[PDB]
C-alpha cells in the first residue's frame, strides 16, 4: 500500500529509536513489519518504551 512504502524517516520516531532501527538496516515499513515485537525488543538498545512508540506511530499511519 502507499503507506508501506513510506521511509522510516517519516515515522517521526525518536532520534534514539530511529538511529537504532537504521543501525539494524531497517529502511522501509515493510522491513519493520518483517520484525515481531520480540524481534523489536532484541534490537540492541531498543526498549519496550521504544517499541510502544513504534506501535503508536504505526497506529498513526493506520
Partner DNA sequence: TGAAAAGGTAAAGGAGGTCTTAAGCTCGGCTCAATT
Partner DNA sequence: AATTGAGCCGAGCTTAAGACCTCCTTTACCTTTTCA
- Does residue 48 bind DNA (CB under 7 A)? yes
Place of cell 513504534: 54
Q: Does 16 bind DNA (CB under 7 A)?
A: yes
| Binding region for DNA (CB under 7 A) out of 2-10, 13-21, 30-38, 54-62 | 13-21
Residues 5-28 as b/e (b if ≥16 CB within 10 A, e otherwise) read eeebeebebeeebbebbeebebee
Q: Does 12 bind DNA (CB under 7 A)?
A: no
Nearest-5° angle of CA 37, CA 21, CA 19? 140
> Residue 19 interacts with DNA (CB under 7 A)?
yes
Q: Which residue ranges make up the site for DNA (CB under 7 A)?
A: 15-16, 19-20, 41, 44-50
Amino acid at each position: 500500500t502507499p503507506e508501506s512504502q513510506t521511509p522510516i524517516e517519516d515515522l517521526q520516531l525518536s532520534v534514539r529509536a530511529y538511529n537504532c532501527l537504521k543501525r539494524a538496516q531497517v529502511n522501509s515499513v515493510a522491513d519493520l513489519l518483517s520484525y515481531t515485537y520480540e524481534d523489536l525488543l532484541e534490537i540492541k538498545n531498543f526498549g519496550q518504551k521504544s517499541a510502544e512508540e513504534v506501535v503508536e506511530a504505526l497506529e498513526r499511519i493506520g
